[PDB]
């Protein structure tokens with residue numbers, strides 16, 4: 001009898017959750033293909049193994 | 051294929067256009083407060099002031 | 100190109116995407132009697148027996164000349180120097196015309 | 198936990214995020230900057246650093262004549278970042 005506040009609260013929390021999922025997807029998924037470094041590690045002296 | 055003496059250089063190009071959808075505004079709504087709660091009623095409006 | 104949309108705006112971004120790439124052997128610079136030549140605007144590539152100076156975003160191979168390469172330093176500090184000749188359009192003409 | 202609250206898992210786990218980051222690192226190490234603007238074209242890292250120096254107005258001959266010094270400084274900075282960081286993550290901890 002108090003109304004439909006609970007539906008609004010559930011909707012807001014669900015929206016926040018999907019927002020965070022899409023947010024991390026936007027931040028990290030910037031490329032369409034997966035690249036891998038070649039097995040031999042030589043770049044003129046730069047040490048990327050760290 | 052990476053090496054310290056190998057470079058890849060394009061010999062052709064493709065021009066492609068893409069969309070970018072961006073909302074800039076929403077519906078300008080404005081609801082007054084006194085009529086929404088009380089409603090055309092002086093007796094109820096007297097408990098709102 | 101902007102386009103109006105209901106309660107929003109739409110852009111048609113015209114971009115330039117390269118395509119049809121092919122491998123080329125490169126080199127940081129070229130040598131001439133202990134005088135390195137670096138590319139003024141471009142990159143050195145190879146066809147198997149001789150080198151060229153093409154731009155970075157397109158294949159426009161050009162014969163290496165002093166016009167499009169600037170001299171800097173000797174041929175000892177830089178690693179990966181390859182031996183090739185450049186074209187100087189001053190010597191053969193003077194030799195022929197005396 | 199047991200009063201009406203739950204925590205959903207993220208859409209992509211930490212392994213997948215690390216795989217994305219590794220792919221991006223490999224792309225920017227091998228291809229340079231072109232892997233984000235079309236097909237990825239390989240280029241030796243010294244030449245990529247020569248192009249990146251040319252961006253800030255410093256000519257290419259500066260890098261090659263002292264490439265070893267550049268490599269040593271880069272290695273020193275990357276190795277010292279762990280000491281500088283592990284001894285902070287304030288903006289990540291305050292959210293949690």
Ligand SMILES: *[C@@H]1O[C@H](CO)[C@@H](O[C@@H]2O[C@H](CO)[C@@H](O)[C@H](O)[C@H]2NC(C)=O)[C@H](O)[C@H]1NC(C)=O
Pocket residue numbers: 061062063064
């Ligand atoms: C660069 O690519 C374009 C296509 O993106 C090529 O254009 C084609 O050229 C062939 C030539 O035999 C034609 O039969 C096609 O109809 C063309 N297609 C289009 C869409 O115009 C172009 O030839 C390529 N250039 C080089 C030098 O390879």
Ligand SMILES: *[C@@H]1O[C@H](CO)[C@@H](O[C@@H]2O[C@H](CO)[C@@H](O)[C@H](O)[C@H]2NC(C)=O)[C@H](O)[C@H]1NC(C)=O
Pocket residue numbers: 146147148
């Ligand atoms: C690489 O580029 C050269 C430059 O045009 C192509 O033509 C060669 O040019 C040299 C000098 O002018 C000649 O000695 C060669 O005989 C030319 N090549 C042929 C096949 O005749 C060359 O064709 C290109 N490709 C290769 C694999 O060298």
Ligand SMILES: *[C@@H]1O[C@H](CO)[C@@H](O[C@@H]2O[C@H](CO)[C@@H](O)[C@H](O)[C@H]2NC(C)=O)[C@H](O)[C@H]1NC(C)=O
Pocket residue numbers: 130182
């Ligand atoms: C490229 O050029 C350099 C310099 O001319 C060559 O190095 C010389 O090679 C000759 C070969 O008999 C030696 O006698 C000299 O002592 C070398 N040094 C100098 C300073 O002349 C080099 O061999 C050439 N070829 C390559 C692949 O580097």
Ligand SMILES: *[C@@H]1O[C@H](CO)[C@@H](O)[C@H](O)[C@H]1NC(C)=O
Pocket residue numbers: 040042052053054055179
């Ligand atoms: C790196 O360059 C050296 C000589 O410049 C060559 O012997 C070596 O094979 C190169 N590395 C790769 C992975 O091709």
Ligand SMILES: *[C@@H]1O[C@H](CO)[C@@H](O)[C@H](O)[C@H]1NC(C)=O
Pocket residue numbers: 051056121122123124
């Ligand atoms: C580039 O592609 C050609 C064509 O397949 C191949 O023969 C060559 O080994 C590749 N790599 C280089 C450095 O040319």
